[PDB]
A paper describes a structure:
[name].17 was evolved from [name], a higher-activity mutant (S265T) of the in silico design HG2 that was engineered post-design to reduce the active-site conformational heterogeneity observed by molecular dynamics analysis of HG25. Over an evolutionary trajectory that yielded the [name].3b, [name].7, and [name].14 intermediates, a total of 17 mutations were introduced into [name] to produce [name].17, resulting in a catalytic efficiency increase of approximately three orders of magnitude.
Perhaps the most successful example of the improvement of a de novo enzyme by directed evolution has been the engineering of [name].17, the most active Kemp eliminase reported to date. In contrast with all other HG variants, the unbound state of [name].17 is correctly pre-organized for catalysis in a large portion of the molecules in the crystal, with only Trp44 adopting a non-productive conformation at 62% occupancy. In this variant, Met237 adopts exclusively the productive conformer in the unbound state, which is stabilized by packing interactions with the neighboring Met267 side chain, a mutation that was introduced late in the evolutionary trajectory ([name].14 to [name].17).
Author numbering: 4 to 302
Write the structure that this text describes.
């Protein structure tokens, strides 16, 4: 039973999964993604250090492979992250001149999005921009450009591909009482009021056991920012309890603007957190109790 087909039947857009050429060419990953998922999300091949390892010298081979595989198999594509502090080459973080960095950032955004224009459903434009107390995270963009780097990034992305949905994303947005959750809602409200084209908030749900229950209140709070969409991505759950996974799915179903869920890989041994067995398929590529519980809940 395909959880993507079942979640579409309930009115959502997709159940997706993070992957890349390394996974699609080994084991049973390709067969499972074909059968059970409706959207793919490159784990590393679209990040800055992979795509622009030297300034103006782009490398698209891995990203091209993923996009072509998705189109051939009828899958939606989400891609990112265009601007964040992870996967960032030193040549970028060493820039100290504001105009130089604005132009570098705009060029990185425009080049990636133009190459795949019309083919990408969702771009993660800005990621992990907030500290745990709700202040903005001090990365090179904030240090050199200032808080305007976020509006500039989204305005540039919107001009490059008006078809794509443009997201901001962060982690630890899983509790409605946590300062970070309330801060991103307030800031996104203000940005949208100023005309900034933020289409979505993506919640990076790398969850500890038992945190699914709190998502039932956190996700509606994120939806109150008034973006056209919200999504769940990078989802995994330590221990992979059915209770946590079903709670996360029910939160999605309860929030009308939540378009879908993307899990953080297929099989446990390929997770960065493999020792906590946090995914929906085990090391033999067999569906786990959590997978069957999602199927049963959606039916």
């Amino acid at each position: 039973q395909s959880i993507d087909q079942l979640i579409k039947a309930r009115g959502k857009v997709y159940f997706g999964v993070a992957t890349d050429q390394n996974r699609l060419t080994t084991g049973k990953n390709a067969a499972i993604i074909k059968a059970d998922f409706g959207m793919v999300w490159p784990e590393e091949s679209m990040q800055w250090d992979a795509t622009e390892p030297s300034q103006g010298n782009f490398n698209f081979a891995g990203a091209d492979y993923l996009v072509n595989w998705a189109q051939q198999n009828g899958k939606l594509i989400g891609a990112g992250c265009l601007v964040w502090h992870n996967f960032l080459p030193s040549w970028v973080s060493s820039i100290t001149d504001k105009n130089t960095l604005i132009n570098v950032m705009k060029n990185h955004i425009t080049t990636l999005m133009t190459r795949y224009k019309g083919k990408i459903r969702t771009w993660d434009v800005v990621g992990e921009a907030f500290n745990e107390d709700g202040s903005l995270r001090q990365n090179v963009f904030l240090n050199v450009i200032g808080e305007d780097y976020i509006p500039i990034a989204f305005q540039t992305a919107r001009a490059a591909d008006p078809n794509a949905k443009l997201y901001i994303m962060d982690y630890n947005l899983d509790s409605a009482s946590y300062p970070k959750t309330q801060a991103i809602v307030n800031r996104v409200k203000q940005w949208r009021a100023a005309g900034v084209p933020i289409d979505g908030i993506g919640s990076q749900m790398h969850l500890s056991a038992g945190q699914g229950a709190g998502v039932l209140q956190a996700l509606p709070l994120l939806a109150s920012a008034g973006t056209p969409e919200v999504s769940i991505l990078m989802l995994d759950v330590a221990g992979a309890s059915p209770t946590d996974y079903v709670n996360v799915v029910n939160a999605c179903l309860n929030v009308q603007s939540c378009v879908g869920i993307t899990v953080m890989g297929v099989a446990d041994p390929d997770s960065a957190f493999a020792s906590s067995t946090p995914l929906l398929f085990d090391g033999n590529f067999n569906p786990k109790p959590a997978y069957n519980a999602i199927v049963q809940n959606l039916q």
